[PDB]
Write a protein that binds this ligand. Structure first.
Ligand SMILES: [Mg+2]
Lengths: 417, 168, 377, 180
């Protein structure tokens, strides 16, 4: 960082350097004849280089009026970065996760230099290989991109065009793969508290296995035991069952997926009648998607609307479909399906058209990653049957890959023909 | 940029900064100064760090995979041959660890907010600021309009397939 | 155009989910290969290798014949008209296709559902997988026509165990599918009636992995063991007699055993040997024994030199005489240019193996894309 | 180990038989057989002295039984045979390195990008070539470990003290059925 006293020092030095350059040029001119009418009254009073003097007079007056704390921070003017809202704990956990992996790496390289036997050296070399292939491994897609970038720096003309397009496609694919990989535990969250997760699941798994062996042994010794010892073993077995039930509860943590948006489609108050009156509960229908072809939905019922929405949010990542899109912006062909009495039409569109849909269809198509589709809901506009008809329609589209596999023939886009 | 001062004392400080801009000599000397050169170098490094969010260092490793491997081959060959019967070992370890740290360290998005920069419309407008005069020579771009609206919000109006560079 | 509608009928294409099959459908010539058929086959296989949506390829035959070899009547009529260019072009096209089959980047499977002769084995046996049936009969009767077992037949016969390659290339002996499994020339075996089952299984595999294809072919294949009367139970006779240095030594030793032991197999093998041209027997033995210690591009190179010498009628006209006697006049009694084995000299058989590229000529050599294909088989 | 040496003997006999028949043309075949036996006896004596390395690295003194041109031709034929074996084993390793799953997935990604034709084939052969280099460096490290282990074991003992030419072997679908 830079101290404010250092800033005052450098601005005073700059004003001084202006004065020194003015006097040095005045000296150089004045020694060689050369009257200084362009130095005096041309860099002092009648320069007016930016028209900044009224701004100086306005700022000078506003600096001698009020009192506060002179070193009090305030709200910034050119603030609102707005993408600076990411949870900082995950990011500051990434730092020391990488640091622990790097320290382990440095320890194995220092152990490789402390061996005495080449059998030991080979063993630590294989340990280093198994470490690097599991924690510092570069994905092969980045090797393809690096080779293509090597061809690109010396390419020109048509080859430069074609390589730029290919690397653009590759960069999109690797960014998507890194952001939405289900195997990376960094792509998961906790939801409100309803390799660390790996080891915290392994310890519970080993505890459950130990409790199951103990319970089997105690049931075995309960089968041949009669009397008060039988009752004491029964109480011991009940305590073991309680421990195992609590440990099984502790493994059920619902996870949300990062990079997904979840939206409410419908919150409804339903009712049931008893002799004491009406019993009123809430149902919530919600959809989720990652804007990259993955879409899901869930319906939940609870006592309040908030609780129903929360249960649906926990359930929404449990039924995810993958939807194929044409060129990441539209569907391959026109599709018409019906679910019960809800008829849905979808039409593909060129690339500057937009989305023409009602709110349920628009929300689902937006979350699946589409950009240019026209649609029409004909008949009943039940929102849940509309959701189901949208998922039925998007799974009945036959892509050119599908046609190519179904008919054993090559399918070509017509503009490449 | 590196002078994140409180409001009132920066407002008192701006008078001294405004006096330096009163003359052409002051603007010339501000341009040719080690202050703005340090600011420029820090902003260059800051712009370099933001590229790692796109996995830039992984592309750098993918370009240079063979020689990065050859460093490890050299280290293993030396630590086999000159050990089967130490500044070389320390030098090779320092180099390999420096390379592994430079190629494997994840992107670090700091707390400090990014400074918002003025855009120049050089894709379709050619300007000579001396007179000033300008000539239109091309068409505008949908991704270069300098609005402060996020992409996910504005996609509800544009419906653009972003990432190809085209006006789509 | 419209004139190529017959060639597209002669080489059909059947497409499956991730695989293509080439079908030979020339029933007049028993699926004999012509120059446009080889050109179409080469175009198809090049396009299918380039296509990343195709996992593996197939080669089948329609009818009771898989492939009866090359169509030599057109070459005979071309040689009769003076110019030798048509035979040349047919030969480098055929050897180029065989080289493509030997170096092919995707898995290739051949279904051998009938008689396979000559270059019919040459387009299929260099492949990765080979399926033999109970109708599969493999023979190499090139010496009895006045020609040599070309199209890579000096590559895979020379690599059989013992000296069985020499026996097959000199006698023209029939091999069955079980025996072809035993010799290692066929990878898998299934009955003819069970081929729709394997063909439906193979068609809708969506795998690139050769291990998955091998496991599927073995799982749907049939388990067979060679019979007691098989050729391979007489392999020690082959190594005893056909391992001699020259052809006349083999004939003399077999004649001596026929005089002493009266072996019926020896009499039948003599009746097999005596029906061949004396020149091509020696060229065949030399090329079989030379091809044991060299790669496929080299084998196809000197096979091209032998073919291009045999069609120019430089030292003999046994090619045209054998073709005429056994295909045109059909009296089946040819008269070779040397009637006897002893008339054939060392200088005559060295004219077939000479570096014709040293005669200030370029198209007398076989071109092969060894730099682009970067051979690995 | 018998297969490699037997292939070397077969290639060497096949070349040197023609070389001897060209060299001494007037002599009969039995003299050629005897000289081939003497030549192969001297070559296997060289191999049993110091392996295949000294047959291709630096020429020793010639034996007085043969001439200097004969030993030079034998040396060049041995070099040619070992180079043919090196090329053949390299191609047989490329057979399984082209189809290796890392190269297969890199080629899958490259073809999914749009890289086809000759550029894809070139990149496939390249990636197989760096995999071959990595595995041969690994094998050289393994061989060096073995040799240093054996020599250190032998040095520490002093401190710790005080092809049938045509036999069938039937195998179908990876199931060896050679038993009687
Ligand atoms: Mg209505």
């Amino acid at each position: 960082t830079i101290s404010p006293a250092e800033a005052d020092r450098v601005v005073r030095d700059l004003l001084a350097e202006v004065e020194k350059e003015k006097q040095r040029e005045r000296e150089e001119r004045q020694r060689q004849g050369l009257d200084c009418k362009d130095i005096d009254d041309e860099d002092e009073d009648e320069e007016d280089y930016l028209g900044i003097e009224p701004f100086i007079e306005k700022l000078k007056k506003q600096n001698l009026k009020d009192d506060g704390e002179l070193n009090r921070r305030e709200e910034s003017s050119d603030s609102d970065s707005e993408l600076d809202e990411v949870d900082w704990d995950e990011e500051r956990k990434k730092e020391d996760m990488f640091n622990k992996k790097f320290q382990r790496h440095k320890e194995l390289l220092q152990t490789l230099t402390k061996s005495e036997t080449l059998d030991e050296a080979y063993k630590w070399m294989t340990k280093l290989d198994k470490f690097e292939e599991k924690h510092f491994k570069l994905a092969p897609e980045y090797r393809v991109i690096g080779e293509l970038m090597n061809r690109l720096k010396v390419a020109e003309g048509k080859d430069k065009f074609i390589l730029q397009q290919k690397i653009n496609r590759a960069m999109r694919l690797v960014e998507w793969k890194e952001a939405f990989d289900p195997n990376n535990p960094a792509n998961y969250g906790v939801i409100e508290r309803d390799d660390d997760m790996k080891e915290r699941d392994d310890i519970l798994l080993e505890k459950l296995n130990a409790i199951d062996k103990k319970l089997e042994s105690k049931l075995s010794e309960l089968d041949h035991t009669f009397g008060k010892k039988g009752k004491r073993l029964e109480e011991e077995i009940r305590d073991l069952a309680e421990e195992r039930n609590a440990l099984t509860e502790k493994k059920r943590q619902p996870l949300y997926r990062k990079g997904y948006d979840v939206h409410v489609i419908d919150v409804k108050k339903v009712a049931k009648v008893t002799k004491g009156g009406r019993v009123e509960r809430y149902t919530a229908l919600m959809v989720c998607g990652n804007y990259e072809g993955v879409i899901g939905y869930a319906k939940a019922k609870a006592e309040t609307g908030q609780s129903a929405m929360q249960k649906a949010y926990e359930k929404c990542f449990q039924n995810l479909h993958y939807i194929e899109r044409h060129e990441e912006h539209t569907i391959a062909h026109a599709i018409q399906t019906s679910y019960k009495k809800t008829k849905l039409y979808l039409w593909p569109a060129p690339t500057t058209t937009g989305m023409k849909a009602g709110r349920v269809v628009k929300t689902m198509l937006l979350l699946a990653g589409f950009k240019n589709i026209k649609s029409k809901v004909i008949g009943s506009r039940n929102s849940y049957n509309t959701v189901k008809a949208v998922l039925k329609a998007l799974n009945a589209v036959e892509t050119p890959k599908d046609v190519q596999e179904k008919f054993g023939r090559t399918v070509v886009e017509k503009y490449l023909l | 940029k590196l002078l994140h001062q409180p409001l009132r004392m920066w407002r008192r400080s701006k008078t001294e900064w405004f006096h330096l801009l009163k003359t052409k000599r002051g603007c010339r000397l501000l341009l040719k100064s080690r202050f703005l050169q340090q600011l420029r170098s820090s902003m260059q490094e800051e712009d370099l760090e933001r590229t790692k969010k796109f996995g830039s260092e992984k592309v750098c490793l993918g370009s240079s995979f063979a020689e990065h491997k050859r460093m490890k081959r050299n280290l293993l060959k030396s630590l086999f041959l000159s050990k089967r019967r130490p500044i070389v070992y320390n030098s090779s370890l320092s180099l390999y660890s420096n390379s592994t740290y430079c190629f494997a360290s994840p992107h670090k998005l700091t707390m400090k907010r990014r400074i918002k920069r003025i855009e120049l419309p050089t894709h379709y407008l050619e300007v000579n600021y001396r007179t000033p005069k300008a000539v239109v020579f091309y068409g505008p771009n949908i991704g270069h309009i300098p609005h402060d609206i996020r992409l996910k919000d504005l996609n509800l109006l544009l419906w653009s397939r972003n990432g190809r560079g085209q006006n789509i | 155009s419209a004139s190529d509608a017959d060639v597209q009928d002669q080489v059909s294409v059947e497409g499956k989910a991730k695989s293509r099959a080439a079908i030979l459908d020339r029933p007049s010539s028993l699926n004999a290969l012509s120059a446009p058929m080889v050109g179409r086959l080469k175009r198809l296989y090049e396009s299918w290798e380039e296509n990343p949506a195709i996992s593996f390829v197939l080669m089948k035959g329609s009818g009771k014949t898989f492939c009866s070899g090359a169509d030599v009547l057109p070459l005979y009529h071309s040689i009769n008209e003076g110019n030798t260019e048509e035979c040349k072009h047919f030969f480098g096209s055929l050897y180029n296709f065989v080289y493509l089959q030997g170096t092919y980047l995707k898995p290739n499977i051949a279904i051998m559902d009938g008689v396979t002769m000559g270059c019919g084995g040459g387009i299929s046996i260099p492949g990765m997988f080979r399926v033999a049936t109970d109708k599969t009969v493999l023979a190499h009767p090139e010496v009895q026509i006045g020609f040599h077992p070309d199209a890579g037949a000096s590559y895979y016969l020379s690599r059989l165990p013992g000296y069985l390659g020499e026996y097959l290339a000199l006698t023209g002996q029939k091999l069955d599918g079980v025996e072809m499994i035993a010799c290692g020339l066929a990878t898998h075996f299934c009955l003819h009636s069970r081929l729709g089952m394997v063909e439906e299984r193979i068609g809708k595999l969506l795998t690139d992995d050769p291990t998955v294809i091998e496991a599927s072919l073995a799982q749907y294949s049939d388990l067979v063991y060679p019979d007691n009367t098989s050729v391979l139970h007489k392999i020690e006779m082959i190594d005893r007699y056909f391992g001699l240095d020259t052809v006349e030594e083999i004939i003399e030793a077999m004649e001596n055993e026929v005089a002493d032991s009266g072996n019926e197999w020896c009499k039948k093998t003599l009746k097999q040997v005596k029906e061949a041209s004396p020149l091509s027997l020696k060229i065949t033995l030399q090329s079989i024994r030379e091809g044991r210690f060299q790669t496929l591009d080299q084998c196809l190179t000197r096979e091209y030199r032998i073919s291009l010498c045999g069609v120019s009628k430089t030292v003999s006209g046994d090619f045209c005489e054998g073709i005429r006697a056994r295909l045109v006049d059909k009296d089946f009694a040819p008269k070779w240019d040397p009637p006897r084995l002893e008339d054939v000299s060392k200088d005559m058989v060295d004219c077939y193996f000479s570096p014709a590229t040293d005669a200030d000529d370029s198209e007398s050599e076989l071109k092969l894309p060894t730099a682009q294909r970067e051979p690995y088989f | 180990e018998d297969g490699t040496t037997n292939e070397f003997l077969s290639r060497f006999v096949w070349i040197m038989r023609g070389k001897v028949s060209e060299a001494y043309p007037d002599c009969d075949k039995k003299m050629i057989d005897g000289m081939l036996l003497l030549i192969v006896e001297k070559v296997v004596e060289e191999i049993e002295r110091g392996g295949f390395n000294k047959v291709g690295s630096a020429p020793p003194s010639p034996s007085s039984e043969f001439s200097d041109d004969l030993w030079a031709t034998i040396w060049e034929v041995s070099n040619t045979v070992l180079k043919d074996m090196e090329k053949e084993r390299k191609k047989e390793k490329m057979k399984q390195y082209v189809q290796s799953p890392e190269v297969m997935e890199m080629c899958r990604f490259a073809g999914e990008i749009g890289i086809r034709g000759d550029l894809l084939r070139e990149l496939r052969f390249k990636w197989a070539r760096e995999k071959m280099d990595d595995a041969e460096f690994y094998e050289s490290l393994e061989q060096q470990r073995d040799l240093d282990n054996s020599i250190r074991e032998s040095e520490t003992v002093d401190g710790e003290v005080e092809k049938r030419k045509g036999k069938l072997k039937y195998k179908i679908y990876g199931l060896e059925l050679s038993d009687p």
